[PDB]
Design a protein around this ligand. Structure first.
Ligand SMILES: O=N[O-]
Ligand SMILES: O=N[O-]
Ligand SMILES: O=N[O-]
Ligand SMILES: [Cu+2]
Ligand SMILES: [Cu+2]
Ligand SMILES: [Cu+2]
Ligand SMILES: [Cu+2]
Ligand SMILES: [Cu+2]
Ligand SMILES: [Cu+2]
Lengths: 335, 336, 335
C-alpha cells in the first residue's frame, strides 16, 4: 500500500569502485528499505592496453564497469542518475533487476545537464546486469563501458541446493568488457577528438562480432600484478561476474567454483564443483569458493585466446599453508 | 505397438498457422495417444529480409521462415506429409530433433522436386525441439536458408514448474531466430542472384566466417514489430518458445524476465527461474514463461546487443493495462 | 598425512588412444589408491584435412586430444610427464580437476630433456579438461592440440538426479579441437618446417577468434569409417566431450542425450531428454544415452557450419532391429 511504501526507512549508501563492493550484510538487517544510490555519468578517454589504445568511455560513477549495488529482496532501489552538462550525449539506465519501462531505461533518459530519480522494487533475488540503453544506439553505449551489475540478496542470505547457509568472507565484482576499437590501414588503433567521431568506424568493428579487447575492470591487466584480488586459505569468496553484451566462461585457474549460480539467480539451485562456468551476454553470474591452497591464481575467460591474447585475465594472491595431500610435486622437473 | 494398434489410435488432422502464432491445441492432453497429422509443402522462394530490400532465396517449410510450430503431446505420434513441389529445384528432407532413428527422420524423407513422403514418429520426450532440413553434403546451406522450425511435445498433463505446481499459459508465441549469411559486392552492398544456385559458392564463403550478416526473428529485421508486434496484457501468462537451428542465442525480454525458463527446452529438466537473460545453444529450442506486470512496449531480443540492434534480432510486445508504481516509479523525471 | 597416502595401494594404468578409454571400473574397487599414469609429450606434424593441411601438434601421449585418464573420487592421480629431448618447447600440465599451483602447471614446467611427477587428490567427481599452459604461450599450446580430459567417477558409480544408478555398457571420449591455420595470400594453407616458425602467423589467425577447422580427434573425418564409434540397439553409451578453448554444442543426430551432465560435474544433477547440450570452452561434459534404433548416426557440434564445413562430425555405427513404433516411413519418397 501507499502509506506502507511511504513509511519504509530510507537509507543512503556510499559506493565503492569495482572490484570492491560497498558495505552490506548478507542477511537482511531489519525490514525492507528504500536503498538510495547516486551515480554521476562520466564521458572520458581511458587507456585500455600497454600500447596506449584509447576508448571514449561512458562510465556510470566514473568507472568501467559501473559499481556494484547491493540490496536485499523486496527492498526498493532508488537511484539518482546525473548527466553533467560537460557530457555531450544523452544517457539512461536499464536495470535487468527491474520490472517495467524497459528496465527503467524509458523513464531515465537524461541529456547533458539533467538528472533523474528512479525507484524500483527488487522483487527477484540474484546478480543482475544494469546498462545504459539510449534508443537507436544501445550497443554503442554498452560496449563503451556503460554497464555494471547489482546484487539482490535473499533476505536470509545465500544457501546451497539443500538450504544450508553459504556465508562468504569476501566478495569481488569482476565486470568483463568487450571493446571494438577501430584501426587504420596500417593496423594501428585510431584516436578521436570526441566520442561521436568514432561512431561509424566503431559500428563497423562491432558488426564483425569480434572484439579487439576483452578486459576486466576496464583495461588489460587491471586486476593483475599489484592489483590482484586477495584471499587466504580457508576463506570463502564470492566472485560476481557480468558481461552486458557478450558471452563469457569464467574459470579460477588452480581452483573451482564450489557453488555457481551460473544464471545468476538465487532461486535457481547453484551448480557445484565447477571447473568452468558460462555467463551469456546480458547477464551476471556468481561463484562461491573456499580457497585451499596459497599462491597466485589466475581468473580468466576460458576462451584462452580472449584471456591471454585479448586481455581477459585477473589474478588472486592467496596466503596460507600449502596442502601436500591436495597436491604435491613427487619429482620436480629434472633431466 | 503394432501398426494396427497405432492404426486403431484416433487420428486428428491439424491446420498449421504461420509463426509467431501457434495452431489450436490443449495444454493438458485430450484423451489418450493420437496420431496427429500435419502436412507441409516446401517452397523455394525469394524473401526480403530488411528495409533495404536485401533478398534471400529461402527454403521454407510451409512457405515460412521459420517453419510453423507443430504441437502434440508426449506419446502421441506425429505423422507428417512433406511435399517437395515440381517447381522446386532441390531435394529436401526433414530431421525432427524430437524423433528417434534415421537421423531424426532425415534419412527416410529425402524427396526430390515432384515427390512427397509421409513420416511418422512417436513423440516420446516432452519439450520444444528444432526440426530442419538436412540433405547430406548441403545441410548448413539449407538450414541457414531458412529451412528450419520447431515442435512442442507437451507433457500429457500440461506444463508444471520444478516443484510440480501447474503452469498454464494464457497465450503462446513461437519466435524462430535465423542467422543469414548474405554475400556482398566490392562496394559492401548485398548481392542478389537469379537462382538460389548462383548464390551457393558465395554464401558458403560467408558462412565460413561464422559471422552472419543478419540475425532476425520471423524471417526479417523488424518482422515482429509495428502492427506485427506480439501482444499481451498486465496479468497475462505468456509462453515464448524460441529456437535457433544453427547458432547460439541469448533471449531477453527488456523490462521483464523469464519467470520459468526451460533453457534446454526439455520439460523433464526443471526450469530455471527469475531469468534476466537465458541461453539456447545452436541446434535447440527453449521456452520461457512470464506473467506481465507492467503495461507499455517491450523489446524481446538476442542479448548480444550488436546482434539485436545492428543485426536484426529484436521483436516488440505491446502490453495493455495499468502501471504499477510499487514495482517502478519515476521519482524525479529527467530535469535540470 | 604423507604416511597415510604412502600406505595407500598404488596402481599403474595403461593409457589408450581416444576415442577409446583405458580399462576401469564404474564402481570403485576398494579404498582410495594412488593411480599412476605416464605420458610422453610429442611435437609432431598432423594432417587435419584431405587437402593435406598440417598442424604442428603438441600432443600428450602422441594424440590430439591427449588420452582420458579415469580415477575415482578421492583417489590420487599421479602423473609422470615426460618432455623428450626431441621436443623444442617447454611444456607443463594444468588439470582442471586439481586444486593448487594453477592446476599443477606451476609445478610441472619441463624443458626438452626433462620430466616431473605430479600427484593430486581427485576431490571432485566429474569430467575435467587438462591442458598445457606455459606462461605467455598458453592459448598457442592449447590450440595446437595440447589438451585432453580425465574422468573422476563417484566411488559408487554414476547415478541420475534421483539417485538411481546409471551404468554404461560403453564409453567414448570425443576431444574437440579448434585449429587456426595460416593461409598464404592465395587462400592456401601454409606449411612450416618447425613449430616456432608458425607462431607469429598462427597468433594472427587466433586473434580473429575464427577457427579454420573445428575437428574431433585431431582431423576432419577422424571418427568416421575405420574409427566410427560402435554400439548396439539396447546399449547404454557415455559420450565424454571436451573443448579446452572454445564453446561447443554436441548433438547426436537421430538420438538424444538421455542424461547430460552439461557442466561435466557429477554432483550437479544431469539435464534429461537433451537434443543439443552446451559445453563452454574450457570444460568437459558427458552424455548418457541408450540406443533404440539401428543405423549410422552422426554426432556433431550443432553449429552446422562448424560440423559440416569446418569438420566437427563423427559417426556411430549401431547394430540392432529397427523399431517401427518409434519411427516409420508411412509413405517412402515417391510421386
Ligand atoms: O585453467 N586455465 O587455463
Ligand atoms: O535489456 N536489453 O538491453
Ligand atoms: O541433428 N543434426 O543437424
Ligand atoms: Cu550511455
Ligand atoms: Cu539489457
Ligand atoms: Cu532443404
Ligand atoms: Cu539438427
Ligand atoms: Cu605445451
Ligand atoms: Cu584451463
Amino acid at each position: 500500500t501507499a502509506a506502507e511504501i511511504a513509511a519504509l526507512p530510507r537509507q543512503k549508501v556510499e559506493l565503492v569502485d569495482p572490484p570492491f563492493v560497498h558495505a552490506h550484510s548478507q542477511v537482511a538487517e531489519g525490514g525492507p528499505k528504500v536503498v538510495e544510490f547516486t551515480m554521476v555519468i562520466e564521458e572520458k578517454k581511458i587507456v585500455i592496453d600497454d600500447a596506449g589504445t584509447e576508448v571514449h568511455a561512458m562510465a556510470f560513477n566514473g568507472t568501467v564497469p559501473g559499481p556494484l549495488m547491493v540490496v536485499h529482496q523486496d527492498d526498493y532501489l532508488e537511484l539518482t542518475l546525473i548527466n553533467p552538462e560537460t557530457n555531450t550525449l544523452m544517457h539512461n539506465i536499464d536495470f535487468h533487476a527491474a520490472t517495467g519501462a524497459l528496465g527503467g531505461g524509458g523513464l531515465t533518459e537524461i541529456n547533458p545537464g539533467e538528472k533523474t530519480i528512479l525507484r524500483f522494487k527488487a522483487t527477484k533475488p540474484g546478480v543482475f546486469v544494469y546498462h545504459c540503453a539510449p534508443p537507436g544506439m544501445v550497443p554503442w553505449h554498452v560496449v563503451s563501458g556503460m554497464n555494471g551489475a547489482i546484487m539482490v540478496l535473499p533476505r536470509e542470505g545465500l544457501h546451497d541446493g539443500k538450504g544450508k547457509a553459504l556465508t562468504y568472507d569476501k566478495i569481488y565484482y569482476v565486470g568483463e568488457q568487450d571493446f571494438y576499437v577501430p584501426r587504420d590501414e596500417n593496423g594501428k588503433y585510431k584516436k578521436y577528438e570526441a566520442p561521436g567521431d568514432a561512431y561509424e568506424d566503431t559500428v563497423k568493428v562491432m558488426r564483425t562480432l569480434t572484439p579487439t579487447h576483452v578486459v576486466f575492470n576496464g583495461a588489460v591487466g587491471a586486476l593483475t600484478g599489484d592489483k590482484a584480488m586477495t584471499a587466504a586459505v580457508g576463506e570463502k569468496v564470492l566472485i560476481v561476474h557480468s558481461q552486458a553484451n557478450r558471452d563469457t566462461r569464467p574459470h579460477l585457474i588452480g581452483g573451482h567454483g564450489d557453488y555457481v549460480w551460473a544464471t545468476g539467480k538465487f532461486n535457481t539451485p547453484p551448480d557445484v564443483d565447477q571447473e568452468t562456468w558460462f555467463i551469456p551476454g546480458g547477464a551476471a553470474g556468481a561463484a562461491f569458493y573456499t580457497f585451499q591452497q596459497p599462491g597466485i591464481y589466475a581468473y580468466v575467460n576460458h576462451n584462452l585466446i580472449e584471456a591471454f591474447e585479448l586481455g581477459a585475465a585477473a589474478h588472486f594472491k592467496v596466503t596460507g599453508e600449502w596442502n601436500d595431500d591436495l597436491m604435491t610435486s613427487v619429482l620436480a622437473p629434472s633431466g
